[PDB]
Amino acid sequence: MYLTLQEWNARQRRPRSLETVRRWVRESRIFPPPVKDGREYLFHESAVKVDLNRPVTGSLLKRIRNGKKAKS
């Protein structure tokens, strides 16, 4: 039923740090909130960032391909 704080960080796209996710809990921007068991916080497989300032970083990729001229 519950995902661990370490497995929640590993499932968030590009995992940064366990202190970064613990700072996001101290800001109160993850909903619904995780259950404190005693050793570490238990997140449900559904709890996500609520009203965040991060849409997309912006990555373009383009190639250049050459041609060839033949005569007779």
Side-chain angles (χ1 to χ4, degrees):
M1 286 68 249
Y2 297 109
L3 192 68
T4 301
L5 187 156
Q6 188 180 27
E7 287 83 83
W8 195 92
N9 188 51
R11 277 146 183 78
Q12 294 307 285
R13 63 186 174 273
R14 202 214 198 190
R16 289 173 177 83
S17 80
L18 304 176
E19 296 200 278
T20 309
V21 172
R22 200 271 272 273
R23 208 95 88 88
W24 299 357
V25 178
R26 292 195 127 282
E27 274 76 272
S28 302
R29 260 199 280 96
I30 301 156
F31 218 82
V35 176
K36 192 193 171 183
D37 198 79
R39 215 92 288 158
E40 187 166 63
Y41 275 93
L42 287 175
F43 288 73
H44 192 263
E45 61 165 89
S46 71
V48 288
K49 290 111 80 274
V50 73
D51 197 293
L52 63 297
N53 192 265
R54 231 114 182 95
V56 69
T57 59
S59 183
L60 246 78
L61 203 85
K62 189 173 177 70
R63 73 167 85 182
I64 205 74
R65 189 159 75 169
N66 210 325
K68 209 273 183 178
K69 278 183 280 182
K71 192 69 162 69
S72 298

